[PDB]
């Protein structure tokens, strides 16, 4: 029956959500196993073959089982993502749209600039009847109505929010009894909101991590056809290991600067190629045998490609590659050309790139130290210096861990949300009203209990 | 200006705040055009000066090139500036910036295809996904669902998720096809 | 060195008022006091707009303060600029 | 134990020179410079070994005849027929070579995969030869700082 099968389904989905991370790491383990077993891959001998050398004789079934397991684990990771991370993203976007609607009116007093696909897509969800699905405040459709009902018209706000104000009057009046049961497939289909699920699927497809996991799926599926597609799964270490993520964030912190440096290097070498094309043409003769002339700089594109591929990679420069200038009219100009090329392209630009990378390391370290000493010298909420509290022994730690703990503030927010609105105390109601109007004045700023009651306490 | 001066000079006069709420609209309208500074007055006291901010001056100031000039001037006066001539340099920058804004105001005289494609795809693919429920094609799996057991249910929802994934594959393939169509 | 110079400028602006030269903490004793002082009381944009207002305005209709500041601007004496003191410091116990 | 074994074989005495690290604290600062970020350096070497493995896989899939190292055309000596041999060649030759794997393996002129080969060489030089070594040296310098 329905109530048992749905319960077991919920148990399975919860299991996947719980084991999402473990299977994410174990998929990487399987990837390293398949790549290690592919380390013995060999080309057999036009007819082109591909067969593994199996010393034990069971390597082929081994990586076949490994590939099937990796593909199944990919499906389980796809399921676990939708179990665990998708609700958080949906809650974030849904609450953001709700706040923009109630406080900014992005669909009544404002309209999306048509370059924001997020807003253009979220225009659909307001009409749905399954809104605040994840956001706790189911009262946003009434807050917007009370706030903006008169200036745009109850009818227009009701049509935009897709609410049955006409049925509200009939509901408050005598409403006839109707048979209703969830056992009916038609009934459960009507309960399912097609448009809200459409919006949710759009959001999930837009989500970046879901796209990465789908790419992982596609690469595993293609790896079944061609076993060497499994190598791309090693690109998951960047996200699996945060220690490697620091090293990668070092170079990606100044990624724009590095890309611009590479572009400048490509432009300077193009200018040098133009100079060579204008003056130093016979010098670029690369013919090993004098009988067959092979000129690398007769054409602009060929000369530029040669400059890149050879000079940029060569340690000495383009001079150590192209012919010697001795006993020629352009000897001194050629020498100056080579020296300038070596100093600018080979030395300075590479020095620029390495210095950018090192400066990125330094900036990241300074940012971490800044965060550290900021936390250790200023209270997060109070903003008061540590010395004033430290006038009493362990005063700063007492203030930061007992009086003004951000964990305590978060737990108070949870307590207010979980508690029923009717049993709110005076302070609870006061803070709840300012939280619902999004006024953060109740948070202590610059003053504390010790400051206010200093001479009474001391 | 009169009301703002009174309110600032007396911060806690209840009648003053009441008359201020009676005078909200004009104050809100004239707030952008109202400016306040503090000068070192002749009476050896700090006094506030209220003057008129012109719309043209504010727009020219908010233009990005003037903002870059402000950033460069701040960087210069902070790094290679001294307290002896810091405020002299500030006055020189103010004069140059006033001249250039007066010149600029004087001289001044008075993806959607991709969004459509990505929205049509996100509609149509989901319509095809829900099309079988719309047709009520689950009656074929109904007779097998009649055999309630764990293995049958697990294979059933695995088949459902497989259908979802193949619909996703059709979506991504159609996205690639549309991208190739835009290219060609 | 360039990065350190940029950071120096940044934290200098965020810790000291440009004209007053007063520390941020004294204003911050009242919530948002430093930002209020730097964006409403002692805005360099406001000072520049005042200079423009003095230049554009005719000399005959100058008020007392306008004439006083105009004379010191024309003699290039920047004493009228607040240095080390502000309205809050001068009228502290009356305002508070 | 090393001294006792050095009695049997006189060259075991060389390992006693590894005591300078602890004898001299001035050398200990220099060594603590590299051991401060030892985990980062080891992970950087592992990442370099993984990236070069990906490049080796790409070469094994597409650029096979380019890896012909036969000095004489009579005797074919192929360094990338086998996955392990190709990876070991990539390490030992390309990682140590200043220019990269392109300055070592054959020239691509007049071939169908010319542009792909050129992009392969340029990416190898920029990532493996330049960036990763820059990463290691920057880690060391940041450790000093
Ligand atoms: N509201 C606050 N709550 C806790 N610590 C605070 C707060 N404001 C400032 N701090 C500073 O943070 C220190 C401890 O909190 P923090 O979260 O920074 O430490 P941690 O080492 O990350 O903690 P944990 O062991 O929980 O991981 C305090 O000693 C104090 O210097
Ligand atoms: N006279 C001043 N006017 C404005 N800001 C000041 C002044 N003196 C100091 N500041 C500091 O500068 C901050 C904002 O001004 P600033 O010009 O530095 O910011 P910004 O990010 O460049 O501004 P914008 O958005 O206009 O480009 C204030 O919060 C304050 O810390
Ligand atoms: Zn606190
Ligand atoms: Zn000021």
Residue numbers in the entry:
A (entry chain D): 4480 to 4524, 4555 to 4967
B (entry chain C): 4100 to 4209, 4237 to 4310
C (entry chain C): 4872 to 4967
D (entry chain A): 4727 to 4871
Question: What does the literature reporting this entry say, word for word?
Answer:
Ryanodine receptor type 2 (RyR2), an intracellular Ca2+ release channel located on the sarcoplasmic reticulum (SR) of cardiomyocytes, is essential for cardiac muscle excitation-contraction coupling. Structurally, RyR2 is a 2.3 MDa homotetramer consisting of two functional regions: a massive cytoplasmic region, also known as the cytoplasmic shell, which comprises several regulatory domains (NTDs, NSol, SPRYs, RYs, JSol, and BSol domains) and the stabilizing subunit calstabin-2, and an activation core and pore region, which comprises the Ca2+ binding site and the transmembrane domains. Dysregulation of Ca2+ handling, characterized by aberrant SR Ca2+ leak, is a pivotal pathophysiological mechanism in a spectrum of cardiac disorders, including heart failure (HF), atrial fibrillation, catecholaminergic polymorphic ventricular tachycardia (CPVT), and other arrhythmogenic disorders. Here, we solved the cryogenic electron microscopy structures of ryanodine receptor 2 variants linked either to heart failure or inherited sudden cardiac death.
Here, we present the cryo-EM structures of the post-translationally modified RyR2-S2808D in the presence of low non-activating Ca2+, conditions that resemble those of RyR2 in failing hearts during diastole. Finally, we added rapamycin to compete the calstabin-2 off of RyR2 to simulate the calstabin-2 depletion of RyR2 observed in failing hearts. Rapamycin is a macrocyclic drug that specifically binds to calstabins in the same site as RyRs do, sequestering calstabins and preventing their interaction with RyRs. Therefore, it prevents calstabin binding to RyRs. As expected, treatment with rapamycin rendered channels depleted of calstabin-2. We observed that RyR2-S2808D totally depleted of calstabin-2 is in a primed state comparable to the CPVT mutants, consistent with leaky arrhythmogenic RyR2 channels (RMSD = 0.30). In the absence of calstabin-2, the changes in the calstabin binding site go in the same direction as those seen for the CPVT channels. Therefore, we propose that calstabin-2 stabilizes the closed state of RyR2 by preventing the relative rotation of the NSol, SPRY1, SPRY3, and JSol domains, thus sterically blocking the most downward-outward conformations of the cytoplasmic shell found in the primed and open states. On the other hand, the RyR2-S2808D mutation induced leak would be worse in vivo due to RyR2 oxidation, nitrosylation, and calstabin-2 depletion, all of which occur in failing hearts, leading to increased primed state structures as observed by cryo-EM.
